Amino acid sequence: GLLIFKPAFPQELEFYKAIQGDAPLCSWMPTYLGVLNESKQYLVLENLLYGFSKPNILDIKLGKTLYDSKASLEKRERMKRVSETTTSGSLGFRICGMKIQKNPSVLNQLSLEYYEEEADSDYIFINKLYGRSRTDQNVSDAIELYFNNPHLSDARKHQLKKTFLKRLQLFYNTMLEEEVRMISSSLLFIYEGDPERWELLNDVDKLMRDDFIDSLSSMSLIDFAHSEITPGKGYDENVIEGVETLLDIFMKFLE
Ligand SMILES: Nc1ncnc2c1ncn2[C@@H]1O[C@H](COP(=O)(O)OP(=O)(O)O)[C@@H](O)[C@H]1O
Ligand SMILES: [Ca+2]
Ligand SMILES: [Mn+2]
């Protein structure tokens, strides 16, 4: 699974083409590789999950405002509604979903309408309904749930939280300098749930994701169907606001 095939939306295609001591925006993004014509057209992207034994995945949508310049007013009113009733409008981010290895402990406390299991595997999908129902005050517990892997020590989990704090510091620094407007982009967190792979890598993570063309975890920026480069127009404060709230949350973890 080296490559991912997304259905191409022109705006997202255009954003990847326009982009591709602070780290540059593109170093947070999947490597864009081209298009495939099936016609149906697909973006071909590097698979961020490649090389993980047991990837544990968190999708956080960024921004208070969840509609773009061109949003039809019917769905602009919908996106105001989503923002005002979730942590998006108050914190600048919301949990969109997770795909994680089940901790039996966790599982029992979580209501059945919040996840999908399976007899074929040790994974649960934690759904959008879970993310939308988080409050300002309980969302950080949602993020803790994410890292609460049954296979990892408290030491390794601590290490992971410190690693993403630092990536958040870096991504924040990137964003102060980037002249873009990204509507409904997500941060994608991934971490290795297989302790054998930790041993193989000797608990050594890499702050920045490896170059695909020329990790025990990663944080990436994805989903650019409502994003544009806006040179001269200054930094994306809508997005930065959610990053700032994530920094505060991760600093509380380490306190
Ligand atoms: N490069 C990638 N590698 C691995 N998984 C990806 C990649 N891009 C997207 N995904 C997966 O697809 C999910 C949603 O894709 P997204 O980019 O949000 O699409 P949409 O524009 O349809 O909302 C993410 O939660 C993630 O698990
Ligand atoms: Ca070893
Ligand atoms: Mn998305």
PDB file of N, CA and C in Angstrom, residues 48-132:
ATOM      1  N   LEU A  48       0.164   7.596   3.730  1.00  0.00           N
ATOM      2  CA  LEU A  48       0.707   7.958   5.030  1.00  0.00           C
ATOM      3  C   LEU A  48       0.796   6.781   6.024  1.00  0.00           C
ATOM      4  N   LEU A  49      -0.033   5.751   5.803  1.00  0.00           N
ATOM      5  CA  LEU A  49      -0.056   4.507   6.605  1.00  0.00           C
ATOM      6  C   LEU A  49       1.055   3.503   6.268  1.00  0.00           C
ATOM      7  N   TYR A  50       1.703   3.676   5.122  1.00  0.00           N
ATOM      8  CA  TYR A  50       2.777   2.797   4.702  1.00  0.00           C
ATOM      9  C   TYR A  50       3.915   2.688   5.714  1.00  0.00           C
ATOM     10  N   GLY A  51       4.288   1.444   6.018  1.00  0.00           N
ATOM     11  CA  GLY A  51       5.389   1.178   6.952  1.00  0.00           C
ATOM     12  C   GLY A  51       4.968   1.027   8.414  1.00  0.00           C
ATOM     13  N   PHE A  52       3.679   1.216   8.711  1.00  0.00           N
ATOM     14  CA  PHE A  52       3.202   1.002  10.079  1.00  0.00           C
ATOM     15  C   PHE A  52       2.738  -0.433  10.190  1.00  0.00           C
ATOM     16  N   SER A  53       3.099  -1.088  11.280  1.00  0.00           N
ATOM     17  CA  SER A  53       2.581  -2.422  11.559  1.00  0.00           C
ATOM     18  C   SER A  53       1.115  -2.333  11.991  1.00  0.00           C
ATOM     19  N   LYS A  54       0.878  -1.583  13.062  1.00  0.00           N
ATOM     20  CA  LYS A  54      -0.448  -1.401  13.614  1.00  0.00           C
ATOM     21  C   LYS A  54      -0.748   0.123  13.739  1.00  0.00           C
ATOM     22  N   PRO A  55      -1.068   0.801  12.605  1.00  0.00           N
ATOM     23  CA  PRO A  55      -1.323   2.259  12.698  1.00  0.00           C
ATOM     24  C   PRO A  55      -2.583   2.578  13.486  1.00  0.00           C
ATOM     25  N   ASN A  56      -2.482   3.516  14.412  1.00  0.00           N
ATOM     26  CA  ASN A  56      -3.624   4.051  15.148  1.00  0.00           C
ATOM     27  C   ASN A  56      -3.856   5.519  14.704  1.00  0.00           C
ATOM     28  N   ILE A  57      -5.042   5.804  14.172  1.00  0.00           N
ATOM     29  CA  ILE A  57      -5.283   7.005  13.356  1.00  0.00           C
ATOM     30  C   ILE A  57      -6.345   7.950  13.935  1.00  0.00           C
ATOM     31  N   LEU A  58      -6.031   9.252  13.966  1.00  0.00           N
ATOM     32  CA  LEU A  58      -6.932  10.307  14.467  1.00  0.00           C
ATOM     33  C   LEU A  58      -7.016  11.382  13.427  1.00  0.00           C
ATOM     34  N   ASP A  59      -8.239  11.743  13.070  1.00  0.00           N
ATOM     35  CA  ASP A  59      -8.518  12.832  12.144  1.00  0.00           C
ATOM     36  C   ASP A  59      -9.168  14.020  12.875  1.00  0.00           C
ATOM     37  N   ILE A  60      -8.449  15.126  12.944  1.00  0.00           N
ATOM     38  CA  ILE A  60      -8.969  16.352  13.508  1.00  0.00           C
ATOM     39  C   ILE A  60      -9.188  17.431  12.433  1.00  0.00           C
ATOM     40  N   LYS A  61     -10.434  17.858  12.201  1.00  0.00           N
ATOM     41  CA  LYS A  61     -10.730  18.998  11.301  1.00  0.00           C
ATOM     42  C   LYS A  61     -10.296  20.321  11.924  1.00  0.00           C
ATOM     43  N   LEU A  62      -9.618  21.145  11.124  1.00  0.00           N
ATOM     44  CA  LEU A  62      -9.124  22.434  11.587  1.00  0.00           C
ATOM     45  C   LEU A  62      -9.968  23.635  11.130  1.00  0.00           C
ATOM     46  N   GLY A  63     -10.206  24.569  12.057  1.00  0.00           N
ATOM     47  CA  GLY A  63     -10.821  25.849  11.767  1.00  0.00           C
ATOM     48  C   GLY A  63     -12.077  26.091  12.559  1.00  0.00           C
ATOM     49  N   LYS A  64     -12.344  27.361  12.882  1.00  0.00           N
ATOM     50  CA  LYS A  64     -13.641  27.770  13.419  1.00  0.00           C
ATOM     51  C   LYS A  64     -14.696  27.886  12.339  1.00  0.00           C
ATOM     52  N   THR A  65     -14.346  28.582  11.260  1.00  0.00           N
ATOM     53  CA  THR A  65     -15.195  28.750  10.087  1.00  0.00           C
ATOM     54  C   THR A  65     -15.019  27.535   9.187  1.00  0.00           C
ATOM     55  N   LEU A  66     -16.136  26.907   8.812  1.00  0.00           N
ATOM     56  CA  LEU A  66     -16.077  25.638   8.090  1.00  0.00           C
ATOM     57  C   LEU A  66     -16.574  25.682   6.637  1.00  0.00           C
ATOM     58  N   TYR A  67     -16.796  26.891   6.106  1.00  0.00           N
ATOM     59  CA  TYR A  67     -17.171  27.101   4.694  1.00  0.00           C
ATOM     60  C   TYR A  67     -16.175  28.032   4.024  1.00  0.00           C
ATOM     61  N   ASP A  68     -16.063  27.907   2.697  1.00  0.00           N
ATOM     62  CA  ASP A  68     -15.140  28.713   1.884  1.00  0.00           C
ATOM     63  C   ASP A  68     -15.855  29.809   1.094  1.00  0.00           C
ATOM     64  N   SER A  69     -15.084  30.603   0.347  1.00  0.00           N
ATOM     65  CA  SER A  69     -15.625  31.741  -0.419  1.00  0.00           C
ATOM     66  C   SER A  69     -16.789  31.369  -1.353  1.00  0.00           C
ATOM     67  N   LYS A  70     -16.798  30.133  -1.844  1.00  0.00           N
ATOM     68  CA  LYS A  70     -17.685  29.721  -2.935  1.00  0.00           C
ATOM     69  C   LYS A  70     -18.838  28.840  -2.462  1.00  0.00           C
ATOM     70  N   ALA A  71     -18.922  28.621  -1.152  1.00  0.00           N
ATOM     71  CA  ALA A  71     -19.953  27.768  -0.559  1.00  0.00           C
ATOM     72  C   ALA A  71     -21.371  28.271  -0.841  1.00  0.00           C
ATOM     73  N   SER A  72     -22.201  27.420  -1.445  1.00  0.00           N
ATOM     74  CA  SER A  72     -23.601  27.770  -1.687  1.00  0.00           C
ATOM     75  C   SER A  72     -24.225  28.106  -0.343  1.00  0.00           C
ATOM     76  N   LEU A  73     -25.103  29.110  -0.308  1.00  0.00           N
ATOM     77  CA  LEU A  73     -25.639  29.601   0.973  1.00  0.00           C
ATOM     78  C   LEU A  73     -26.431  28.557   1.763  1.00  0.00           C
ATOM     79  N   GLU A  74     -27.010  27.586   1.053  1.00  0.00           N
ATOM     80  CA  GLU A  74     -27.739  26.467   1.657  1.00  0.00           C
ATOM     81  C   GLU A  74     -26.810  25.662   2.577  1.00  0.00           C
ATOM     82  N   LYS A  75     -25.591  25.405   2.113  1.00  0.00           N
ATOM     83  CA  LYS A  75     -24.630  24.599   2.867  1.00  0.00           C
ATOM     84  C   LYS A  75     -23.646  25.428   3.723  1.00  0.00           C
ATOM     85  N   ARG A  76     -23.528  26.723   3.424  1.00  0.00           N
ATOM     86  CA  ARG A  76     -22.872  27.691   4.308  1.00  0.00           C
ATOM     87  C   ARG A  76     -23.603  27.809   5.652  1.00  0.00           C
ATOM     88  N   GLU A  77     -24.935  27.729   5.613  1.00  0.00           N
ATOM     89  CA  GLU A  77     -25.754  27.718   6.827  1.00  0.00           C
ATOM     90  C   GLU A  77     -25.613  26.399   7.586  1.00  0.00           C
ATOM     91  N   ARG A  78     -25.487  25.296   6.848  1.00  0.00           N
ATOM     92  CA  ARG A  78     -25.132  24.000   7.442  1.00  0.00           C
ATOM     93  C   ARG A  78     -23.781  24.016   8.171  1.00  0.00           C
ATOM     94  N   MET A  79     -22.771  24.639   7.560  1.00  0.00           N
ATOM     95  CA  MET A  79     -21.420  24.659   8.121  1.00  0.00           C
ATOM     96  C   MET A  79     -21.259  25.614   9.297  1.00  0.00           C
ATOM     97  N   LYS A  80     -22.144  26.607   9.387  1.00  0.00           N
ATOM     98  CA  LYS A  80     -22.251  27.468  10.565  1.00  0.00           C
ATOM     99  C   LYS A  80     -22.836  26.665  11.714  1.00  0.00           C
ATOM    100  N   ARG A  81     -23.758  25.763  11.380  1.00  0.00           N
ATOM    101  CA  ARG A  81     -24.466  24.933  12.346  1.00  0.00           C
ATOM    102  C   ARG A  81     -23.520  23.899  12.966  1.00  0.00           C
ATOM    103  N   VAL A  82     -22.729  23.239  12.128  1.00  0.00           N
ATOM    104  CA  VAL A  82     -21.685  22.312  12.564  1.00  0.00           C
ATOM    105  C   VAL A  82     -20.657  22.996  13.487  1.00  0.00           C
ATOM    106  N   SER A  83     -20.249  24.200  13.118  1.00  0.00           N
ATOM    107  CA  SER A  83     -19.269  24.943  13.889  1.00  0.00           C
ATOM    108  C   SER A  83     -19.792  25.385  15.254  1.00  0.00           C
ATOM    109  N   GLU A  84     -21.068  25.749  15.315  1.00  0.00           N
ATOM    110  CA  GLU A  84     -21.629  26.327  16.523  1.00  0.00           C
ATOM    111  C   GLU A  84     -22.011  25.283  17.565  1.00  0.00           C
ATOM    112  N   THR A  85     -22.155  24.020  17.142  1.00  0.00           N
ATOM    113  CA  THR A  85     -22.577  22.914  18.019  1.00  0.00           C
ATOM    114  C   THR A  85     -21.489  21.874  18.318  1.00  0.00           C
ATOM    115  N   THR A  86     -20.298  22.104  17.804  1.00  0.00           N
ATOM    116  CA  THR A  86     -19.172  21.230  18.051  1.00  0.00           C
ATOM    117  C   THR A  86     -18.013  22.084  18.587  1.00  0.00           C
ATOM    118  N   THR A  87     -16.870  21.450  18.852  1.00  0.00           N
ATOM    119  CA  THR A  87     -15.701  22.183  19.345  1.00  0.00           C
ATOM    120  C   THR A  87     -15.059  23.014  18.245  1.00  0.00           C
ATOM    121  N   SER A  88     -15.511  22.858  17.003  1.00  0.00           N
ATOM    122  CA  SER A  88     -14.946  23.658  15.907  1.00  0.00           C
ATOM    123  C   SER A  88     -15.120  25.136  16.170  1.00  0.00           C
ATOM    124  N   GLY A  89     -16.355  25.566  16.425  1.00  0.00           N
ATOM    125  CA  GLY A  89     -16.635  26.980  16.585  1.00  0.00           C
ATOM    126  C   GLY A  89     -16.070  27.617  17.842  1.00  0.00           C
ATOM    127  N   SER A  90     -15.832  26.827  18.902  1.00  0.00           N
ATOM    128  CA  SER A  90     -15.311  27.369  20.160  1.00  0.00           C
ATOM    129  C   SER A  90     -13.808  27.189  20.319  1.00  0.00           C
ATOM    130  N   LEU A  91     -13.293  26.023  19.918  1.00  0.00           N
ATOM    131  CA  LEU A  91     -11.862  25.692  20.031  1.00  0.00           C
ATOM    132  C   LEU A  91     -11.022  25.827  18.738  1.00  0.00           C
ATOM    133  N   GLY A  92     -11.663  25.758  17.574  1.00  0.00           N
ATOM    134  CA  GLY A  92     -10.942  25.830  16.298  1.00  0.00           C
ATOM    135  C   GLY A  92     -10.558  24.469  15.725  1.00  0.00           C
ATOM    136  N   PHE A  93     -10.963  23.396  16.394  1.00  0.00           N
ATOM    137  CA  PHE A  93     -10.740  22.043  15.879  1.00  0.00           C
ATOM    138  C   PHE A  93     -11.874  21.153  16.353  1.00  0.00           C
ATOM    139  N   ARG A  94     -12.159  20.102  15.604  1.00  0.00           N
ATOM    140  CA  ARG A  94     -12.957  19.016  16.163  1.00  0.00           C
ATOM    141  C   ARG A  94     -12.481  17.643  15.668  1.00  0.00           C
ATOM    142  N   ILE A  95     -12.698  16.650  16.524  1.00  0.00           N
ATOM    143  CA  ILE A  95     -12.454  15.273  16.187  1.00  0.00           C
ATOM    144  C   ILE A  95     -13.482  14.811  15.165  1.00  0.00           C
ATOM    145  N   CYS A  96     -12.948  14.271  14.101  1.00  0.00           N
ATOM    146  CA  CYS A  96     -13.694  13.850  12.982  1.00  0.00           C
ATOM    147  C   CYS A  96     -13.874  12.310  13.007  1.00  0.00           C
ATOM    148  N   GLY A  97     -12.835  11.580  13.389  1.00  0.00           N
ATOM    149  CA  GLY A  97     -12.940  10.128  13.555  1.00  0.00           C
ATOM    150  C   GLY A  97     -11.628   9.525  14.012  1.00  0.00           C
ATOM    151  N   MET A  98     -11.685   8.291  14.489  1.00  0.00           N
ATOM    152  CA  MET A  98     -10.467   7.546  14.788  1.00  0.00           C
ATOM    153  C   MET A  98     -10.627   6.146  14.290  1.00  0.00           C
ATOM    154  N   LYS A  99      -9.509   5.529  13.960  1.00  0.00           N
ATOM    155  CA  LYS A  99      -9.438   4.096  13.730  1.00  0.00           C
ATOM    156  C   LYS A  99      -8.312   3.566  14.625  1.00  0.00           C
ATOM    157  N   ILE A 100      -8.677   2.909  15.717  1.00  0.00           N
ATOM    158  CA  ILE A 100      -7.691   2.525  16.720  1.00  0.00           C
ATOM    159  C   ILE A 100      -7.866   1.058  17.155  1.00  0.00           C
ATOM    160  N   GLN A 101      -6.798   0.461  17.680  1.00  0.00           N
ATOM    161  CA  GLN A 101      -6.890  -0.835  18.332  1.00  0.00           C
ATOM    162  C   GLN A 101      -7.663  -0.680  19.622  1.00  0.00           C
ATOM    163  N   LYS A 102      -8.647  -1.551  19.831  1.00  0.00           N
ATOM    164  CA  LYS A 102      -9.490  -1.486  21.035  1.00  0.00           C
ATOM    165  C   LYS A 102      -8.746  -1.822  22.321  1.00  0.00           C
ATOM    166  N   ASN A 103      -8.877  -0.927  23.298  1.00  0.00           N
ATOM    167  CA  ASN A 103      -8.531  -1.203  24.687  1.00  0.00           C
ATOM    168  C   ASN A 103      -9.820  -1.721  25.352  1.00  0.00           C
ATOM    169  N   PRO A 104      -9.879  -3.009  25.772  1.00  0.00           N
ATOM    170  CA  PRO A 104     -11.121  -3.489  26.408  1.00  0.00           C
ATOM    171  C   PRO A 104     -11.672  -2.508  27.468  1.00  0.00           C
ATOM    172  N   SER A 105     -10.820  -2.174  28.438  1.00  0.00           N
ATOM    173  CA  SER A 105     -11.002  -1.051  29.379  1.00  0.00           C
ATOM    174  C   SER A 105     -11.760   0.178  28.800  1.00  0.00           C
ATOM    175  N   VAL A 106     -11.140   0.981  27.940  1.00  0.00           N
ATOM    176  CA  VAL A 106     -11.916   1.957  27.128  1.00  0.00           C
ATOM    177  C   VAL A 106     -13.302   1.428  26.693  1.00  0.00           C
ATOM    178  N   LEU A 107     -13.330   0.486  25.739  1.00  0.00           N
ATOM    179  CA  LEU A 107     -14.565  -0.027  25.094  1.00  0.00           C
ATOM    180  C   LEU A 107     -15.814  -0.080  25.963  1.00  0.00           C
ATOM    181  N   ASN A 108     -15.679  -0.586  27.184  1.00  0.00           N
ATOM    182  CA  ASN A 108     -16.833  -0.777  28.052  1.00  0.00           C
ATOM    183  C   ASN A 108     -17.524   0.534  28.427  1.00  0.00           C
ATOM    184  N   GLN A 109     -16.726   1.588  28.601  1.00  0.00           N
ATOM    185  CA  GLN A 109     -17.231   2.914  28.937  1.00  0.00           C
ATOM    186  C   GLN A 109     -17.911   3.643  27.757  1.00  0.00           C
ATOM    187  N   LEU A 110     -17.544   3.302  26.523  1.00  0.00           N
ATOM    188  CA  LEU A 110     -18.048   3.973  25.327  1.00  0.00           C
ATOM    189  C   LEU A 110     -19.357   3.363  24.804  1.00  0.00           C
ATOM    190  N   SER A 111     -20.334   4.222  24.562  1.00  0.00           N
ATOM    191  CA  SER A 111     -21.608   3.791  24.022  1.00  0.00           C
ATOM    192  C   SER A 111     -21.462   3.241  22.611  1.00  0.00           C
ATOM    193  N   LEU A 112     -22.279   2.236  22.318  1.00  0.00           N
ATOM    194  CA  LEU A 112     -22.263   1.500  21.061  1.00  0.00           C
ATOM    195  C   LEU A 112     -22.555   2.349  19.815  1.00  0.00           C
ATOM    196  N   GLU A 113     -23.263   3.463  19.980  1.00  0.00           N
ATOM    197  CA  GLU A 113     -23.540   4.303  18.829  1.00  0.00           C
ATOM    198  C   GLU A 113     -22.341   5.129  18.365  1.00  0.00           C
ATOM    199  N   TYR A 114     -21.245   5.060  19.125  1.00  0.00           N
ATOM    200  CA  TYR A 114     -20.037   5.835  18.850  1.00  0.00           C
ATOM    201  C   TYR A 114     -18.945   5.100  18.067  1.00  0.00           C
ATOM    202  N   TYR A 115     -19.055   3.782  17.924  1.00  0.00           N
ATOM    203  CA  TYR A 115     -18.036   3.040  17.191  1.00  0.00           C
ATOM    204  C   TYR A 115     -18.568   1.848  16.414  1.00  0.00           C
ATOM    205  N   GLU A 116     -17.776   1.377  15.458  1.00  0.00           N
ATOM    206  CA  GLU A 116     -18.033   0.146  14.727  1.00  0.00           C
ATOM    207  C   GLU A 116     -16.870  -0.794  14.970  1.00  0.00           C
ATOM    208  N   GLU A 117     -17.195  -2.004  15.391  1.00  0.00           N
ATOM    209  CA  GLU A 117     -16.200  -3.017  15.677  1.00  0.00           C
ATOM    210  C   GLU A 117     -16.092  -3.963  14.485  1.00  0.00           C
ATOM    211  N   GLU A 118     -15.698  -5.207  14.759  1.00  0.00           N
ATOM    212  CA  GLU A 118     -15.576  -6.309  13.779  1.00  0.00           C
ATOM    213  C   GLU A 118     -14.983  -7.561  14.455  1.00  0.00           C
ATOM    214  N   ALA A 119     -15.425  -8.742  14.015  1.00  0.00           N
ATOM    215  CA  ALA A 119     -14.867 -10.007  14.512  1.00  0.00           C
ATOM    216  C   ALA A 119     -13.576 -10.365  13.760  1.00  0.00           C
ATOM    217  N   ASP A 120     -13.336  -9.713  12.623  1.00  0.00           N
ATOM    218  CA  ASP A 120     -12.149 -10.022  11.839  1.00  0.00           C
ATOM    219  C   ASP A 120     -10.861  -9.356  12.372  1.00  0.00           C
ATOM    220  N   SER A 121     -10.981  -8.412  13.313  1.00  0.00           N
ATOM    221  CA  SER A 121      -9.830  -7.587  13.690  1.00  0.00           C
ATOM    222  C   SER A 121      -9.868  -7.002  15.096  1.00  0.00           C
ATOM    223  N   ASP A 122      -8.727  -6.460  15.520  1.00  0.00           N
ATOM    224  CA  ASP A 122      -8.624  -5.750  16.788  1.00  0.00           C
ATOM    225  C   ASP A 122      -8.884  -4.229  16.670  1.00  0.00           C
ATOM    226  N   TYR A 123      -9.412  -3.766  15.544  1.00  0.00           N
ATOM    227  CA  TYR A 123      -9.662  -2.328  15.392  1.00  0.00           C
ATOM    228  C   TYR A 123     -11.107  -1.905  15.626  1.00  0.00           C
ATOM    229  N   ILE A 124     -11.283  -0.700  16.159  1.00  0.00           N
ATOM    230  CA  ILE A 124     -12.594  -0.044  16.110  1.00  0.00           C
ATOM    231  C   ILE A 124     -12.525   1.215  15.273  1.00  0.00           C
ATOM    232  N   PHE A 125     -13.604   1.495  14.556  1.00  0.00           N
ATOM    233  CA  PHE A 125     -13.777   2.814  13.975  1.00  0.00           C
ATOM    234  C   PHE A 125     -14.626   3.688  14.923  1.00  0.00           C
ATOM    235  N   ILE A 126     -14.018   4.717  15.515  1.00  0.00           N
ATOM    236  CA  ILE A 126     -14.788   5.718  16.267  1.00  0.00           C
ATOM    237  C   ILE A 126     -15.318   6.819  15.320  1.00  0.00           C
ATOM    238  N   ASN A 127     -16.637   7.000  15.291  1.00  0.00           N
ATOM    239  CA  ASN A 127     -17.297   7.718  14.193  1.00  0.00           C
ATOM    240  C   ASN A 127     -17.437   9.235  14.406  1.00  0.00           C
ATOM    241  N   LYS A 128     -17.986   9.935  13.407  1.00  0.00           N
ATOM    242  CA  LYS A 128     -18.280  11.396  13.454  1.00  0.00           C
ATOM    243  C   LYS A 128     -19.225  11.860  14.587  1.00  0.00           C
ATOM    244  N   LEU A 129     -20.184  11.011  14.926  1.00  0.00           N
ATOM    245  CA  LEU A 129     -21.108  11.276  16.012  1.00  0.00           C
ATOM    246  C   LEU A 129     -20.401  11.464  17.367  1.00  0.00           C
ATOM    247  N   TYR A 130     -19.376  10.654  17.618  1.00  0.00           N
ATOM    248  CA  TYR A 130     -18.497  10.816  18.772  1.00  0.00           C
ATOM    249  C   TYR A 130     -17.791  12.164  18.767  1.00  0.00           C
ATOM    250  N   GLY A 131     -17.179  12.526  17.645  1.00  0.00           N
ATOM    251  CA  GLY A 131     -16.511  13.804  17.521  1.00  0.00           C
ATOM    252  C   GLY A 131     -17.388  15.026  17.692  1.00  0.00           C
ATOM    253  N   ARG A 132     -18.550  15.007  17.040  1.00  0.00           N
ATOM    254  CA  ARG A 132     -19.546  16.087  17.127  1.00  0.00           C
ATOM    255  C   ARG A 132     -20.132  16.290  18.524  1.00  0.00           C
TER     256      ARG A 132
END
